[PDB]
Amino acid sequence: SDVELRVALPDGTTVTVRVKKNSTTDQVYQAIAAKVGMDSTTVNYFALFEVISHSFVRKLAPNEFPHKLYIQNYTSAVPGTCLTIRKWLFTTEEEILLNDNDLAVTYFFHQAVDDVKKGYIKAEEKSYQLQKLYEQRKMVMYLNMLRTCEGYNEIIFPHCACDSRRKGHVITAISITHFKLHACTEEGQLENQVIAFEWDEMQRWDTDEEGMAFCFEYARGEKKPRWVKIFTPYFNYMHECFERVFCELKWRKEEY
């Protein structure tokens, strides 16, 4: 029993695949990566995401059925699908190693360009230099410079409540470097406080399905480990980021 699926790719094209009705997300992802020319190296740097809003996409958990998400959220409007292929990688050095892969470079470039437009990457200072490289279409040079800007390979979540703030909310920001909570109002306006947690201070982490919360336990300075709860709806996505960061840290090949 076969069905067609549409999926958005980082360069703005879409692709369609014929997959079995009840396929899981990784089975759909492999089929797509086959249909677009991803080889055995490149395929591990991308994954399936769902568009939530103009400023947030969420990674599909392993036991989801992409076709069910496609059908549920389908409209006539462009792109014609809620599914999208995006980069999945926190260690920007692994990116460099792909600077000779035409497929990878092209996808990295076009998504990085979109992330700059959306404010995730803060070029600002060298905006003009990056614009000239963009206009001459020197993708690798563009990426090599943007890779030094604040916000590259950071995952920003929508603001939400937290059991360890008296009032207001937090915007969670995840990167290979640390785990950052930014203080904001209950409306989402950025206040002026940020806490950085190093990954080495993370003792355990977990989800709370019933309480719609991601949970982490840290041991900072000299005190005793405390649990913090972030009441995010995307708590399984957040847990996957933790597992993935530690995995990339374990297999890191460079002192840089």
């Binding site: 937290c162 360890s164 703030r165 909570l181 203080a183 406080q193 806490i195 913090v228």
Partner: peptide, 6 residues
């Protein structure tokens, strides 16, 4: 306590 305090 509050993270953004002490």
């Amino acid at each position: 306590g509050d993270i953004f305090s002490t």
